[PDB]
Symmetry: C3
Subunit: 118 residues, 3 copies
C-alpha cells in the first residue's frame, strides 16, 4: 500500500518518527507486511480547503485489495487521528482518496504484480 | 471537489488571490458549496510537455459525481481559461485528469462520504 | 501520456537530459507522438519505502489506452531501468501506478480528447 499526504503544515511541524509511525500503523490496519508499505509526506504546500488556508491535507491511499466501505471508514478514523495528533490538522479539513488498484496496474521491480497471464 | 495544479511557472508568478478564485469558480461550475472545495497549486516544478520546458500544467479534478463528457469539456474551458489568464500557460500545454470518485472511496472527518451501509 | 516520478533522491543527482530521455523512451514504448508526452520529476521528497529512507520512487503513468497486462510489464522494465541507471534507485524500491484514462476524462486545450 502507498500513502501520500500533501499539506500546508510547514516542514518544521512534521515530528521525528512520522513516516515510521504511518508505515507501522498502515501495515497494522491493512494486515500487510510493513516491507510493502510506502509513505510520502509533502509539507509547505499552497493549498486551500473551503477557501481558507488553515491547516489542511489532501491524501491518497492506493492498495491492491483491502479497499471498501467499512475498511475505508476505519482507515479514515486512523489517518485523520494521526493527522490531528501529529500535524494539528482538523479531521474536517482532510480528504483521503482511496484507490483499489488491480495487480496488473501496479508496477514494481521491473514488472507488475500480475504474473499469471498474457 | 478537489483541484490540483502542478506547474513549472514560478511561485512569484502565482497571483495572491488565485486559490480563492479557483475555489469560487469551481463552486459555481460544480454547483457545490465552496466549503467542500479544496485547491492545491504546486509551482516551480521540473516538468516538460512535448519535450519543452515552456510553461505547462498537469492537473487533476476529483469529484463525487458531476463528472462526464459534457461537464468535463465545460470544466476544461473554465480551467484552461484561468490558467492562461492568471499563470500565462497556453491551453494546449495543459492536461487535466478527471476522476469521478465513489462516495465510499473518499475519506473526510474520520469517516467517508458513504453513510448508508 | 503523462508520467510523474516522486523521489527522495536529491535534485543535484538528476542528470542533465533526464526529462528528454523519459519523453523519448515513453514515446518509443507507448507508440505515441513525443509532442504530446508530459513528464514531471519531483526530487528531494520526504519518503519511506518498507520503512527505510534509502532511494525509492513513487510513480504514475496515465495514458488513453496502451495500458494492460503485458504492456505494463514492459513499461515497468523500461522505467525501473531508467530510474536504476540514472537516479541509482533499486527497482524493488519503485512503485508505478498505471491508469487507463477514458478520453472524455482527459482535459486539454479548452476541451477533452473525446
Ligand atoms: O495525464 C493526462 O491528463 C493524460 C494525458 C494524455 C495526453 C495525450 C494522450 O494522447 C494521452 O493518452 C494522455
Amino acid at each position: 500500500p502507498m500513502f501520500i499526504v500533501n499539506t500546508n503544515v510547514p516542514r518544521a511541524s512534521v515530528p521525528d518518527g512520522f513516516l515510521s509511525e504511518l508505515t507501522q500503523q498502515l501495515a497494522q490496519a491493512t494486515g500487510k507486511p510493513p516491507q510493502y508499505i510506502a509513505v510520502h509526506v509533502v509539507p509547505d504546500q499552497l493549498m486551500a480547503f473551503g477557501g481558507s488556508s488553515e491547516p489542511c491535507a489532501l491524501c491518497s491511499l492506493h492498495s491492491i485489495g483491502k479497499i471498501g466501505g467499512a475498511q475505508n471508514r476505519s482507515y479514515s478514523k486512523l489517518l485523520c487521528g494521526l493527522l490531528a495528533e501529529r500535524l494539528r490538522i482538523s479531521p474536517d479539513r482532510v480528504y483521503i482518496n482511496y484507490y483499489d488498484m488491480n495487480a496488473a496496474n501496479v508496477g514494481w521491480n521491473n514488472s507488475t504484480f500480475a504474473l499469471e497471464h498474457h
